[PDB]
Design a protein around this nucleic acid. Structure first.
Lengths: 61, 96, 132, 380, 62
RNA sequence: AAUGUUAACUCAGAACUGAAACGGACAAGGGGA
RNA sequence: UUUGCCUCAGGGUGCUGUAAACAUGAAAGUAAACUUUACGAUCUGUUGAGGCUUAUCCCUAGUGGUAAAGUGU
């Protein structure tokens, strides 16, 4: 199954017929939202660090 | 001892029995055939012989094993089973 | 006009629904009885190609629905033996609406048709559409 | 009270008791009768199970819907390893049945026939029929004069030779075949010639005549009612099983009737098939007896691929309608018919069109070895 | 004797053995036994069917 | 505005191919008036 | 129960069906070097050829074995 993981990264078993769980079962959608919020928020903080964006557009975006 | 060239077909011996007892039935048939053919009552198998017919699994013992069997003088008479291994069995007639 | 009607292989018991394949307006027949069937204890009457079958219509024109009619079962799904050393069998299970005297009530049958009824009732020989 | 739905019973009482047959050969209860006018010739035969096969034909029955059109039928071809005639038996009628006046053996006898009189032949001294074949002919002449003066039914002990067949059995099957025909005065001379030689079937067997087949059916051991008599299976909800007869009789009489189907032995019964018309006469050595001048291929009685559980056939053949009972390697007995008829198919002359040669084991592809070889040719 | 040729395969037909399969369209389809009809019945291709002479004709191995 | 180190499993379309059949076993709602 | 029989083998009819390898072959198309180089469900030619085929298939004076004769009359 090491070779099988390589083959799934290769893209053969990408069929819709190896999925025995729902979308949220494989990966937690709330955790995905948390990760996305963290990764965009780190950028939002770095924009204030570099002062590339003003606060007026910073609270907007 | 006596020089003889034959083989044994365990397929025709375990043909009727279920998977659960195919290998022990093969063992029993080997013992019975050895004793009957060699006119002795004390036939002792070999650990290698048990290995060979148990390795393939209980469901399917090996089909056929070649017999060229030798006795032993030390009631008095007793035999130990042995086997001949060869790639192809076709063309190898029975003889002395 | 002779009733030398030849061996038949038995299939299609009572309670089977089959195709119609004719311009009579019906779609599927529902076998309720066949004629010539005698008395056996638990035997279900079943259809023979050369035998009229009492049948109802489940889908089709309301004119011929809600009542019993006679149908000649034409195309079987079971191999019927023949002296020709070879059976005959089909995929579609089919029958054609006929009057009790024997003649077909439709005008043409889409699929292949049975030739025995052509001489069993002379008015089916003329209307035989495409015999196998 | 009465049954609401009267239906025919299960099985026939005429084949009771459904018990294992005592012997393996097919005995004959009755031989075809005799007439003074008809001429003295043979009355029965015997052989083995060569084949119950098809043949293609054309009906000549007036008004038939097939008639001129080619048809396929079902007939049989018999295995006849010639039987050795060894003995003569005389019977005379008495108010207690027909009683044996005497039997006379041929002055020379075969070893296969004598082997039947033993259970352990390999260990015996083979002393049977040793000093009983050295009798003077004065005794024979006196006893045959007695046979003519007193006896009225004449039978011939004939034995088969299983050595010709591939059977493991080495004992010979022995039976007696009646001789039917004219009065005693002609009969005495007509039974003075064939007393030692083997029996060719084509001697009397002729086309357009009816025969019957006697045999012992197959064996299946003990079987339930649903198999022995084909009783209706009880519904799945039944408590103590469903493969049994529900009611085996009313309250009265307070006994089980003998008509009630019960479990027991099925098969290994005595069977006789009647109205089996013989159609054609052939041989074993010849090469075109089974085939026709409209078939113009090569073949003899030889089969293809061997016979499953029967070996190969190297003996005579004839033709006769129908199929047979019994199993493979089972002895079959052939009788003539009892009362010949004058109906249309009773007197109908017949003729075949094509003869099977194929691989009679299951679904094969090649009818002849020559065809199989030619159709491929260059191979591995 | 005269024996017709098979439809799916190329073997002659011997009366006394066969059957007849016919589809909806009513065309005659003559074969020899249940396999010789079922190979066609299972909607398979004689070109792919290795063990028939049709495959040999398709793969020029005469 | 760009170039280097290092950790995901979610999608999508072109193939041909395999006995035109595939949550391949285990695991699992029959629906409707 | 020794012109046998058991076993084995030469086959035979068969059953699925194409079997063990070769590929400076194709092999959907993939990636690494200055045209060649690492995989790729299969087939192609040897391959209408293997594996199994009586234990209840068929043939073979083919060869190995075929044994103690204990009981009753």
């Amino acid at each position: 199954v090491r070779l099988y993981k390589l083959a799934k990264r290769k893209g053969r078993h990408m069929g819709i017929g190896k999925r025995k769980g729902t979308k949220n079962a494989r990966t937690n959608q709330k955790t995905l939202w948390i990760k996305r919020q963290r990764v965009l928020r780190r950028l939002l903080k770095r924009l204030r660090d570099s002062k590339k964006v003003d606060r007026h557009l910073y609270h907007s975006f | 001892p006596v020089t003889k060239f034959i083989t044994i077909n365990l397929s025709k011996l375990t043909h009727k029995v279920c998977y659960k007892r195919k290998a022990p039935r093969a063992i029993k048939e080997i013992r019975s055939i050895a004793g009957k053919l060699m006119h002795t009552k004390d036939v002792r198998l070999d650990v290698k012989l048990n290995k060979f017919i148990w390795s393939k699994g209980v469901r399917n013992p090996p089909k056929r094993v070649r017999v060229k069997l030798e006795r032993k003088r030390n009631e008095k008479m007793y035999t130990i089973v042995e086997h001949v291994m060869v790639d192809s069995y076709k063309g190898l007639v029975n003889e002395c | 006009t002779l009733k030398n009607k030849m061996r038949i292989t038995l299939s299609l018991p009572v309670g089977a629904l089959i195709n119609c394949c004719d311009n009579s307006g019906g779609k599927n027949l529902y076998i309720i009885a066949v004629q010539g069937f005698g008395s056996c204890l638990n035997r279900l009457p079943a259809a023979s190609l050369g035998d009229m079958v009492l049948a109802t219509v489940k889908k089709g024109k309301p004119d011929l629905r809600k009542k019993v009619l006679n149908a000649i079962i034409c195309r079987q799904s079971k191999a019927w033996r023949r002296h020709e050393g070879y059976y005959i069998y089909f995929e579609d299970n089919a029958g054609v609406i006929v009057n009790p005297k024997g003649e077909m009530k439709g005008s043409a049958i889409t699929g292949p048709v049975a030739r025995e009824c052509a001489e069993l009732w002379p008015k089916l020989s003329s209307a035989a559409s495409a015999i196998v | 009270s009465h049954r609401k739905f009267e239906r025919p019973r299960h099985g026939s009482l005429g084949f009771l008791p459904r018990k294992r047959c005592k012997r393996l050969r097919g005995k004959i209860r009755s031989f075809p009768k005799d007439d003074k006018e008809k001429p003295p010739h043979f009355t029965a035969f015997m052989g083995y199970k060569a084949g119950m096969t098809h043949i293609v034909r054309e009906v000549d029955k007036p008004g038939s819907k097939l008639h001129k059109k080619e048809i396929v039928e079902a007939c049989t071809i018999i295995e006849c390893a010639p039987m050795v005639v060894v003995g003569i038996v005389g019977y005379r009628e008495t108010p207690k049945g027909l009683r044996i006046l005497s039997t006379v053996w041929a002055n020379h006898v075969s070893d296969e026939f004598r082997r039947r009189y033993y259970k352990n032949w390999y260990k015996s001294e083979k002393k049977a029929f040793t000093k009983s074949l050295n009798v003077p002919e004065a005794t024979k002449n006196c006893l045959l004069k007695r046979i003519e003066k007193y006896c009225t039914v004449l039978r011939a002990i004939c034995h088969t030779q299983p050595s010709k067949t591939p059977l493991r059995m080495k004992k010979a099957h022995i039976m007696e075949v009646q001789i039917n025909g004219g009065s005693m005065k002609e009969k005495l001379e007509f039974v003075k010639e064939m007393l030692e030689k083997n029996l060719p079937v084509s001697t009397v067997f002729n086309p357009n005549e009816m025969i019957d087949v006697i045999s012992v059916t197959k064996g299946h051991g003990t079987k339930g009612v649903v198999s022995r008599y084909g009783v209706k299976r009880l519904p799945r909800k039944t408590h103590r099983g469903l493969r049994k007869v529900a009611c085996i009789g009313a309250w009265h009489p307070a006994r089980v009737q003998f008509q009630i189907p019960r479990h027991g032995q099925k098969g290994y019964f005595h069977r006789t098939e009647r109205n089996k018309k013989i159609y054609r006469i052939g041989l074993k050595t010849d090469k075109n007896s089974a085939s026709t001048d409209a078939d113009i291929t090569e073949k003899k009685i030889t089969p293809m691929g061997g016979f499953p559980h029967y070996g190969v056939v190297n003996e005579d053949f004839l033709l006769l309608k129908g199929c047979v009972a019994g199993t493979k390697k089972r002895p079959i007995t052939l009788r003539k018919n009892i009362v010949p008829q004058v109906s249309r198919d009773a007197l109908a002359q017949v003729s075949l069109k094509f003869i099977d040669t194929s691989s009679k084991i299951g679904h094969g592809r090649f009818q002849t070895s020559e065809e199989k070889v030619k159709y491929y040719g260059p191979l591995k | 004797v005269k024996t017709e040729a098979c439809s799916f395969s190329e073997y002659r037909i011997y009366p006394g053995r066969g059957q007849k399969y016919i589809a909806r369209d009513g065309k005659v389809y003559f074969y020899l036994s249940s396999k010789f009809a079922s190979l066609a019945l299972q909607k398979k291709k004689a070109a792919k069917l290795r063990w028939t002479q049709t495959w040999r004709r398709n793969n020029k191995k005469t």
